[model samples]
Target: SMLGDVERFFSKKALEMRASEVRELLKLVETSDIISLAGGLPNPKTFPKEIIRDILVEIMEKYADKALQYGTTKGFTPLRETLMKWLGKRYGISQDNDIMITSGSQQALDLIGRVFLNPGDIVVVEAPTYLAALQAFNFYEPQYIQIPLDDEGMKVEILEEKLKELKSQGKKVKVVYTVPTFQNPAGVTMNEDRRKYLLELASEYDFIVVEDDPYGELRYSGNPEKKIKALDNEGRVIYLGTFSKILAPGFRIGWMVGDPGIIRKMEIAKQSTDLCTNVFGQVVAWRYVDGGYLEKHIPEIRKFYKPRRDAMLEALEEFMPEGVKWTKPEGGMFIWVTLPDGIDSKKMLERAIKKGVAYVPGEAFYAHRDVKNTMRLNFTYVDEDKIMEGIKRLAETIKEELKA
Candidate 1:
């Protein structure tokens, strides 16, 4: 049968691709009545549907030819310009750095891997970093050095130690991937001190730092921290930003800012990936920002997500039993929870599903999948009521496990 023979025709890389555990678990809630705190989805209410509708109509009226046609691999120039201006004003990123539009930050990650990673190349990552980043880099087969993070973010000192150890062995570190601000899963931000130190380490060790900041603008409280890219005087940091959290994910619009040399490399890499990002999305996004809709929309997004984050934190505080620990994030979509020893979040999922609740087990975030008692709960997708109920159900499920 063709199914049995499929393996024979597959390439080595095809065989190495595994399903995302979180994505697989998400399917369980699609047809069920479960309250899912699993996916990092923005609330539908935050989408500016009316604004988008107007933009689409305007595009058809004024830019039908360009908007519908294939775009340059570097992206629609006007959108790139708008993004450059916005990034400059907000993050202090210099105009000297080049920017290229990507399908999404996911594609940017893949392109970075394609341009830089080789088998046995050393790639340093946060221990429980963004899972999809690991997934993208995995295709290139780089060796990883996983450094753990605390409430403040990745332990930079420990990373320094690892870098020194690798240096002693005459190994060169190619890349260090970090979600420094409002980090995923953990909902923690690396403070300015650490951010500075990280940049210093990057310069000393001569490795590229890929700073993915999809959630920086979603801050609900606390003062803003300077982005590592903003701190990059040597242009060693590759900054990734996305419209997914602030505007819409469906558009699949994201941008990468880096050295012009690296940007050109990714440009060539992207030419084979999708030819170009969707022109329709680029035009709409450009007008949305140029027309000042995005400026006003960001505050509304913060208002929408903050209350849901509060609901989840409050619920966890109220219902969770002793020995349970979770982060109180100033901003971002997720909360990291650590259960008591002997409780495996993957094993507990069956019980959680029976109770009509769902969350991503944390082991999926690790490159090695070694941790078992941790899980990631997303508060942005579910409503206040559903978040409250989901946490309650999850707590009850944990209580039962503790008893057993």
Candidate 2:
């Protein structure tokens, strides 16, 4: 049969990989009138349309050939330099630190797995972590140790406990991946105290730290905490940042800052992956940043998303039933909801869709699968009116489930 031939051609790792729940929901979102709080997409209104149009014209008039031509695997040189200046100015990253441009943070995650993971290597992640990162690492077949998160983030006390256990067991822990600032599913930021302690633990235990910070610039309220990369005295943290939130997703511009050696290795690994990032995007982005567009545009983004977040919080408070709880995030696009015991968000989602609302089931974000009472809701994409209506529908769905 044709199916048998297809099965024979597939690699075992390819077979082992599971489809993303988010991707599946995206298809439904495109075709339906469902109020989707599922995808973690930034609001389209925040994109600098006129600014990009002007930049595109400039790129064509000034650098058309270079934009269309295949560029270095390391990416557009001017973009790299512009990024270095931006990172240094904002986060205090020294010029000695290196940057590698990738298609998005998605590609950055894949490259990390390619360079560092092998079958059975131990990697650490936060419980209910970023779903897509877990997917990227799963292909490498590494055993995961997921540490639970609390309000302060990562629950380093528990992480330390795991580190001790791994030491006693003589297991080699290879990577510590965290979304320390405004985490994805939970919307919790790691406190500075825990951030320092986590770095100390990494230094003490001799593992690499990967800080994924795509949402760092989206904070609307709350004093900004220093990036874990900012605190590294020893070069241990590999930081990932993206223009997807502050700029636009269509550009697909994300950069990594890490030790030069590791950056060099990742660049080599990327040579076969996509040859290079989209130079056309990179050139346009460099000009945009160099022309001082990014810095000027960020507050406008915060101004735009902050109201949506506030609306979602208010909606949840007004509509949710007793025993239901959710995170009160100071900033970021998501609000993580925890329904009462015995409620499965995956099952709840089916009912929500019938009610013209949808959200991501939290089970997909976990390293292990039994926790089903949670879901991640994105407030950034839907308008304020729909946020309230969607929450009301979701609350109704949960109430129905509780009765059942």
Candidate 3:
């Protein structure tokens, strides 16, 4: 009876996508000394652990009832206020902004799907976008259009052409989701010019742009560029920020800054969803910021990651095949590696795991089947020595396969 009712009660496609091979593989990577480059995990040593713990303890001591008892739909006042100032000073987001806190940016994206997308509407995205975004929007099942991106980042001209094509075909675009700075798989930053032009295209072409900027502040080098939301006076850009990278992923704290009209709708959507993000987590982050702890701690993370990024680049140069290539991100957790033509990288992941190295196969990042030759390698979790050795082992595994 349980099995018979399930067919009628559950979404078949949702059930199918739920059992992800990549997610299962992440667990395998964790339990081994396999030198994992598969997940975008922050190195434990770089975390502001002691300070964060102290902040949480203090909040529990002073605001125990408020922190535990439940919070409002919008968010805790002090946390949002602190975040407001942080964004203003860092990215220049203003007081006119409306912010909504969620369990994490994961929930933020899902609630966004609820608020904006109608089933079969368009979601134009970079060719290899973040996998989690695709998952969040999948329930709504938007028609995905891939925008070709280069080393400089998303090709604005190509996006315009896709928008025209969709219009001509009578399809409608709801949003264009971008990772913006330090993108997930590719680790490419859409330069300031492209950022403004994308916003201009959204204004002209009729679509909302969701700029998911988790890694923007994780910089070890290069100048920080203004976010696409910075160019918005038209209410076209929606900015999503997360403390997961800089703070802690398990903290489950994230916020979105958008136009009041859209934010009003999302606030209603969030109330019905999770009610609010973890209030204790929010307060801990608030105390951490108020006490000037993160300012002192973030530099340590940056200093820690910069060398790892360089090590991965150097190792790739020394180990991987000549025609194969990768991106050297100025800051962020991941780098995209392209295998030689006609080589299916997804099929090669298990082979690498057998060789004592692991990576998430890249085709999952793409919306369609064309991008089979790519895979994403994360450098933030595994250190320089591990990166160098793991990549070397991976190289040998590929070569070993060729001889077989």
Candidate 4:
């Protein structure tokens, strides 16, 4: 009766929404000895326990009341100020851009969907993008134009042609979302030329750009390119960043910077969603960054994870068969593997799970549930020894699927 009655209480979007494959896979890995390469979880060893404890002590001694009490939906102001200066010093973000703290980058994505998408609006996304973002936007039921990615990142030339076709069809695009630097599902960053070209297209096409940059700081190699947001002179880019990759995910602290008017709209939308992000976490994070701990902490994190990333890449080289291909990432946690044709990653995952290894089926990341030859492997959380063993198991699973 409880199960039957729950159907009546569910809204249309609630019924339409499906579960996250990463979340489901996480649960399976937690219950068993499965060497998980599934979720984009940061290495727990990277968490700043000492920095957080010191900050929490400071918050408790000086600002306990502010930490516990309900704060403005715009979030703790000092944290916003810290982000403004911090981002400016590091990435050339100006005071003109506005910032709003959210529970995490995931909340920022959902708020963007609420603020921007209508039922029939067109959303431009990479073919295999961040799965959580796709899930968040899917609730609003926007029509998607899926552009494919290459070693250089999203194919902006192809996207330009598609936009022209949509223009001929008299369709106006609502939003263009991308994880430009060390992009998810495919660990490719957009070249500087394409970055400029994409911005030009955005200006001509007259649409908002959402640059989600959660993994930017994790780059282990190559010089950083200018963020799509950093180059925006027209106030069209909405930038989202999080402490989850750089700090601890348990704190759930993230922020968005964009046009001030849009930040105000997100604050209103977020107020109904969660009232406000946890003030205690915001205050603690503000102190962590303000005290100069984050600056010192990031390089330590880079040193720790670089070996694990190299381990996975080396193992893939030794284990994977010919005709199988994968991206060689300069940075970020994931390497996108494209299996030979006629192989389904979802089916391979079933066998991998049975063999005590796991990865995300790349199909789940796409806006449409169509692709199956690809899978995403996360190297940050798994140990070097386990990375080697896990990739070997995955290779065997792929070989079995190919033979049968």
lDDT (C-alpha, whole model) for all candidates: 0.92, 0.90, 0.84, 0.90
Off by over 4 Å in 4: 20-26
Per-candidate TM-score against the hidden true structure: 0.98, 0.97, 0.95, 0.97
- lDDT digits (tens) for residues 1-404 of candidate 1: 75887888889999877776657767868557999888877888999999999999999999999999999999999999999999999889989999999999999999999999989898999979998899899999999999998999999999999999998998889999999888898898898999999989998999999999999999999998998999999999999999998899999999999999999999999999899999999999999998999998999999999998899989999999999999888998989999996799998988999998988889888988888999999998777889999999999999988874
The candidate that wins on TM-score is 1
The residue-level lDDT of candidate 2 at 169 comes to: 95
Report the C-alpha lDDT of model 2 over 115-146, residue by residue, as the tens digit: 99999999999988998899899889889999
Better of 3 and 4 by TM-score: 4
Clashes of 4: 0
Candidate 4 lDDT tens digits, 1-404: 75877878889878876776557766868677889898777888999888888888898899999999998999999999999999999999877999999999999999999999989899999988998898889888889999899999999999999999999999978899999988887999989888888889999999999999998889899898898888999999999999998889998999999999999999999999999999989998899889899999999998998898899989999999888999988888999999996788887878888887988888888888789899999998888899999999988888877884
In TM-score terms, candidate 1 sits at 0.98
Worst 10 residues of 2 by lDDT: 21-30
Please report, as a residue range, the 10-residue window in candidate 4 with the lowest summed lDDT.
17-26
Give candidate 2 regions above 4 Å deviation.
1-4, 20-26
Per-residue error (Å), model 1, residue 49: 0.9
Give the per-residue lDDT digits (tens) of candidate 3, residues 1-404: 75876656767665666667777877977898888889877878877878977887897789898888789988888988888888888777766878888788988899888888887888888989988899898888788999877888999889888788878988768899998788898988899889888888888888899989989878878898998877788878889988888888888999999889998899899887777777888888888777778778878888888988989889989988767788878899988987775678777878888888888888888888478888888998876788999889988866765554
Which residues of candidate 1, in runs, are more than 4 Å off?
1-4, 20-22
